[PDB]
Tab-separated table of N, CA and C in Angstrom:
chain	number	residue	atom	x	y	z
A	1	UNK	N	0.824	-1.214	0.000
A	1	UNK	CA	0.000	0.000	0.000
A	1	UNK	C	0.850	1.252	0.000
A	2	UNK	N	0.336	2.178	-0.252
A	2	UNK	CA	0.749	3.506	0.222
A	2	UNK	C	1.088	3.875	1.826
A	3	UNK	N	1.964	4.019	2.275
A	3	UNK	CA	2.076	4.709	3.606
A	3	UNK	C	2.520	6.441	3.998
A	4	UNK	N	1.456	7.452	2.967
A	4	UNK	CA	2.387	8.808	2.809
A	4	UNK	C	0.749	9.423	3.399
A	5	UNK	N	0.030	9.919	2.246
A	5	UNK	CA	-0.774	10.932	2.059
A	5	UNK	C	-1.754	10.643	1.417
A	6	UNK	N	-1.551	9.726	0.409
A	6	UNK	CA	-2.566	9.121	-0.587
A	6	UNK	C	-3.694	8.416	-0.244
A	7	UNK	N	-3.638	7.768	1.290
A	7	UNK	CA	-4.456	7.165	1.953
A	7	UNK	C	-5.799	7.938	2.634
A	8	UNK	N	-5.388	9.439	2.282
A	8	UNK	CA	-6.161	10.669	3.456
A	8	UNK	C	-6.844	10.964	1.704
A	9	UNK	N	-6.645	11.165	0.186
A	9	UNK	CA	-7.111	11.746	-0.893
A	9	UNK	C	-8.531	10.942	-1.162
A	10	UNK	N	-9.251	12.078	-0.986
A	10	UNK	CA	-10.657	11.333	-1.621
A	10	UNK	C	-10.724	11.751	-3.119
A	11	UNK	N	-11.721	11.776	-3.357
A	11	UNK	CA	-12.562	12.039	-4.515
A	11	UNK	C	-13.629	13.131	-4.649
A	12	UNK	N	-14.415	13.279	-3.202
A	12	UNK	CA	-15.879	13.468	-3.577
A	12	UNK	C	-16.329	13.352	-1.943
A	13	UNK	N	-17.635	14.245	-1.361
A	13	UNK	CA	-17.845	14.422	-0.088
A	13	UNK	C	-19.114	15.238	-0.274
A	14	UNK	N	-19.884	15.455	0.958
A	14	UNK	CA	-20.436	16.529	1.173
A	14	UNK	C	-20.363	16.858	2.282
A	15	UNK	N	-20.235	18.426	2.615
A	15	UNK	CA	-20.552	18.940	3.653
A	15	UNK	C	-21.316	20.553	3.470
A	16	UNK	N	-21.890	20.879	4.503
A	16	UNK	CA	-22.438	22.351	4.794
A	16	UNK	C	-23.804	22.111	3.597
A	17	UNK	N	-24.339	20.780	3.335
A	17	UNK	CA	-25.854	20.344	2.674
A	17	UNK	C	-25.060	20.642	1.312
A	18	UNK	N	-24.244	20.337	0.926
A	18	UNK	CA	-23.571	20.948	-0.973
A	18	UNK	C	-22.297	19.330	-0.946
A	19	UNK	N	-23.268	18.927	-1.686
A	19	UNK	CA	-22.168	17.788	-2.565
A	19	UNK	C	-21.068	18.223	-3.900
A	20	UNK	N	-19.890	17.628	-3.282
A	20	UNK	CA	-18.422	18.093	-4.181
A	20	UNK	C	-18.191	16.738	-4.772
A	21	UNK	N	-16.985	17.237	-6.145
A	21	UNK	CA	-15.925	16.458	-6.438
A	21	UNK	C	-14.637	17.206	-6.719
A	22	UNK	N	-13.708	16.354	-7.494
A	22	UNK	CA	-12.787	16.957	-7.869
A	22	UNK	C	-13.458	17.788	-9.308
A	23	UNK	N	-13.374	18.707	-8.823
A	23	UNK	CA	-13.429	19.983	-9.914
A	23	UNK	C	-15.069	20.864	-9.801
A	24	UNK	N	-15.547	20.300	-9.002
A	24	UNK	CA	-16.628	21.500	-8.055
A	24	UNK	C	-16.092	22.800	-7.813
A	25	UNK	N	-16.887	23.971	-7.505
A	25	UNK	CA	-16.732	25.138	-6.922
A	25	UNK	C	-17.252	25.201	-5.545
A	26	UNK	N	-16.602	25.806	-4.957
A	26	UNK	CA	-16.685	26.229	-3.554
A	26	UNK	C	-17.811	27.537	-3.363
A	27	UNK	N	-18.569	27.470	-3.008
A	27	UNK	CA	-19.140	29.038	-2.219
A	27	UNK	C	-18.300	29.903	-1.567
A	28	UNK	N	-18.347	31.178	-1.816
A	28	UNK	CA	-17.605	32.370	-1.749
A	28	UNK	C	-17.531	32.326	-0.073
A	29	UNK	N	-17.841	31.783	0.946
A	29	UNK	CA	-18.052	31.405	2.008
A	29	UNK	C	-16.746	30.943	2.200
A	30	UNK	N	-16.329	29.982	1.331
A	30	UNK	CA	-14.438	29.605	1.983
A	30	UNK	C	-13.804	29.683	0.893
A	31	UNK	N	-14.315	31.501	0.416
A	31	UNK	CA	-12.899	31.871	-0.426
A	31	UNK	C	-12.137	32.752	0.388
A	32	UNK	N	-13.021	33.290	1.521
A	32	UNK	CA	-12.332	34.194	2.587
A	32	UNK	C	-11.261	33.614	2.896
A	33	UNK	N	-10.150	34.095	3.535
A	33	UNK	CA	-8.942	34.060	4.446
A	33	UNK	C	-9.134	33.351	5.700
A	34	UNK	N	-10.364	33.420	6.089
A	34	UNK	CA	-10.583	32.979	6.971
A	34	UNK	C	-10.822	31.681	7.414
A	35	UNK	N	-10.266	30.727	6.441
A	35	UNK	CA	-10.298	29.293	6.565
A	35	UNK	C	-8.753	28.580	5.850
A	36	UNK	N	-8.464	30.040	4.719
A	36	UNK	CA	-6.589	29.943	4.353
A	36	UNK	C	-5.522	29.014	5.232
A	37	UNK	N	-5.513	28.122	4.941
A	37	UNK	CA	-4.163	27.869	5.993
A	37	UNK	C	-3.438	27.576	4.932
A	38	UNK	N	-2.676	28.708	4.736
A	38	UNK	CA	-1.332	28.772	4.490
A	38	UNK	C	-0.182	28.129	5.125
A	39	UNK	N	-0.547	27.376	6.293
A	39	UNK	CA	0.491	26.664	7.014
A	39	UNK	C	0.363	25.418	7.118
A	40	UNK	N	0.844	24.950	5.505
A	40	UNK	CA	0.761	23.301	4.997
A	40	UNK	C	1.934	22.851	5.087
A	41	UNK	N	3.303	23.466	5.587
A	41	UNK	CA	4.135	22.899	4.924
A	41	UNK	C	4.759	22.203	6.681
A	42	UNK	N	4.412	22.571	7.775
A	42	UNK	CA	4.776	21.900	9.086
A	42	UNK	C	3.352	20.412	8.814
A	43	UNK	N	2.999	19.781	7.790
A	43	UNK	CA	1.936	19.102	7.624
A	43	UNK	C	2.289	18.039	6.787
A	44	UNK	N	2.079	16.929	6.747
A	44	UNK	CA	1.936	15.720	5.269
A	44	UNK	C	1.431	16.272	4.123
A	45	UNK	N	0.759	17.179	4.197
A	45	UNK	CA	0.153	17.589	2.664
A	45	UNK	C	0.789	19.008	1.811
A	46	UNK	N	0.516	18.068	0.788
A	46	UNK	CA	1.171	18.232	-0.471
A	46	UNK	C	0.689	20.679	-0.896
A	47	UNK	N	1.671	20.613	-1.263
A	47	UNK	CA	2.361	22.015	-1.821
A	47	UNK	C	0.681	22.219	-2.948
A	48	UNK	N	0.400	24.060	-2.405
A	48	UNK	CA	-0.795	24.069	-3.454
A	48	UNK	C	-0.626	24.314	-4.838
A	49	UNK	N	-1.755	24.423	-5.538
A	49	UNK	CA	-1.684	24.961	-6.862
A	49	UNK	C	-1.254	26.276	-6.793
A	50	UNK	N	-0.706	26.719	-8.058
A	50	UNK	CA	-0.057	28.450	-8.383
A	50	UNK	C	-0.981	29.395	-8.664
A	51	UNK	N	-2.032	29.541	-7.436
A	51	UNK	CA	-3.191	30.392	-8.115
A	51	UNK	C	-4.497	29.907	-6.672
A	52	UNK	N	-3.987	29.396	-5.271
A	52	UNK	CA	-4.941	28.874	-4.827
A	52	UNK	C	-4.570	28.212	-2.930
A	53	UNK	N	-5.014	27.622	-1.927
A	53	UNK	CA	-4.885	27.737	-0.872
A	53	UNK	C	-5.756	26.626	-0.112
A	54	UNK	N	-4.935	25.626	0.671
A	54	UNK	CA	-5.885	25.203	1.402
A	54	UNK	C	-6.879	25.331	2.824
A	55	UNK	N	-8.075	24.892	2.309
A	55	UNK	CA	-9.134	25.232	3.319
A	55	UNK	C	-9.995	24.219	4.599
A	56	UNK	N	-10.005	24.426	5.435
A	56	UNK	CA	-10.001	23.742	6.407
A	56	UNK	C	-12.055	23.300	5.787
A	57	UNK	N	-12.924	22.614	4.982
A	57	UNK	CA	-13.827	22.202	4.601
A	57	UNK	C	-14.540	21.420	6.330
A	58	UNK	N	-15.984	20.912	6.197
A	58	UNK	CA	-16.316	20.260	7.305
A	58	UNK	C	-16.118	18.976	7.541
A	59	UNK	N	-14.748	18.826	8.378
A	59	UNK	CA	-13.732	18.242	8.699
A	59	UNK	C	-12.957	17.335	7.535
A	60	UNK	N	-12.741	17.856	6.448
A	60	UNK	CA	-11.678	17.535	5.287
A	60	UNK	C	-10.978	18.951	4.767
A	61	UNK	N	-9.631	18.866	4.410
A	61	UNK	CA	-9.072	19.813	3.605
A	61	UNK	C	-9.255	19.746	1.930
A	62	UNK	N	-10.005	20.873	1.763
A	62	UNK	CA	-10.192	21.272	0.057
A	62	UNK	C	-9.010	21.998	-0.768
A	63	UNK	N	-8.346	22.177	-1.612
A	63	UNK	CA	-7.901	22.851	-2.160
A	63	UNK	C	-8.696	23.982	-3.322
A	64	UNK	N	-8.684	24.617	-2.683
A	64	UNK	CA	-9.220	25.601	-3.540
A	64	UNK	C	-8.363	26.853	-4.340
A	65	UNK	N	-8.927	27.227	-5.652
A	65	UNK	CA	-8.423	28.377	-6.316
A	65	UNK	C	-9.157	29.621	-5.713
A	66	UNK	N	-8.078	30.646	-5.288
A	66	UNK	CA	-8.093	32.004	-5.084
A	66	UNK	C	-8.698	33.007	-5.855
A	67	UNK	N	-8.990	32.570	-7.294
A	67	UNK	CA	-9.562	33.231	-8.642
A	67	UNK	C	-10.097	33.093	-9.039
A	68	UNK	N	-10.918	31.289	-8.412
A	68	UNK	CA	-12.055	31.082	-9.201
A	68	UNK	C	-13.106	29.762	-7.851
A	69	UNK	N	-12.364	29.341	-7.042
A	69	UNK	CA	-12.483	28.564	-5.977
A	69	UNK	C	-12.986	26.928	-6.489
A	70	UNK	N	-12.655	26.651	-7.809
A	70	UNK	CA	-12.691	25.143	-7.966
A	70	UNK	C	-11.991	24.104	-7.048
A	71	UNK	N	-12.446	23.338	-7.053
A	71	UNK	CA	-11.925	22.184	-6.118
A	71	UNK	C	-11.123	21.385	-7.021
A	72	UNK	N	-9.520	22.122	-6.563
A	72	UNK	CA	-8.656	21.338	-6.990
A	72	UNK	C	-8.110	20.001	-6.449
A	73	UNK	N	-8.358	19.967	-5.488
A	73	UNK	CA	-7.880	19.007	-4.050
A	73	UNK	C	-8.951	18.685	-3.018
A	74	UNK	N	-8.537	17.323	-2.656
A	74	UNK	CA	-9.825	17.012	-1.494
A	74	UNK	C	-8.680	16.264	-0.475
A	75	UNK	N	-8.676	16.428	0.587
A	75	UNK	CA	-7.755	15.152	1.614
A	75	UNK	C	-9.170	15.127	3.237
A	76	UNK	N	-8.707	14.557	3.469
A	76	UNK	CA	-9.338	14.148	4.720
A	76	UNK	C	-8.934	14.954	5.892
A	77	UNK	N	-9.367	15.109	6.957
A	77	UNK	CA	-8.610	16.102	8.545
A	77	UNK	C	-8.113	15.146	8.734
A	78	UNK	N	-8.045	13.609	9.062
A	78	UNK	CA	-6.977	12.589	10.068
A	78	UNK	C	-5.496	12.999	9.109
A	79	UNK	N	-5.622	13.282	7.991
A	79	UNK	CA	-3.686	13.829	7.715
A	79	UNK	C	-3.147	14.722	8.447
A	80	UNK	N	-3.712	15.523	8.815
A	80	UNK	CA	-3.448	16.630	10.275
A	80	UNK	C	-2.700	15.814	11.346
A	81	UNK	N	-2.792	14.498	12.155
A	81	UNK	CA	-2.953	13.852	13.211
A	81	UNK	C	-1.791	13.121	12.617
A	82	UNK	N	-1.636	12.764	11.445
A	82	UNK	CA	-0.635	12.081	10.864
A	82	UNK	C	1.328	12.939	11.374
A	83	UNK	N	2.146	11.740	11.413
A	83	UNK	CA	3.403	11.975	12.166
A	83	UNK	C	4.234	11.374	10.922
């Protein structure tokens, strides 16, 4: 198996009543800063896109674009907990 990060990557989820996949849009709701964590790199997960930021989603991390908020990325919160 995988023992990195790949084990935390979904596909597809819902939360806040709005079903995602990879390549959904986000509601302008977590395009704010206010869910930004810019502080991925003390973390297992992977470096964002050139144009975009990950967001703390209900309890999974999304990657989202800054310019347009597609869902570039989906991981799970237990990668957080991950050592």
């Amino acid at each position: 198996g995988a023992a990195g990060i790949d084990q935390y990557a979904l596909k597809e989820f819902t939360a806040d009543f709005t079903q995602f996949h990879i390549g959904d849009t986000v509601p302008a709701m977590y395009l704010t800063p206010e869910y930004n964590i810019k502080q991925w790199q003390q973390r297992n997960l992977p470096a964002p896109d050139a144009g975009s930021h990950w967001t703390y989603m209900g309890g999974n991390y999304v990657l989202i674009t800054d310019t347009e908020g597609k869902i570039l990325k989906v991981y799970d919160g237990e990668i957080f907990y991950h050592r």
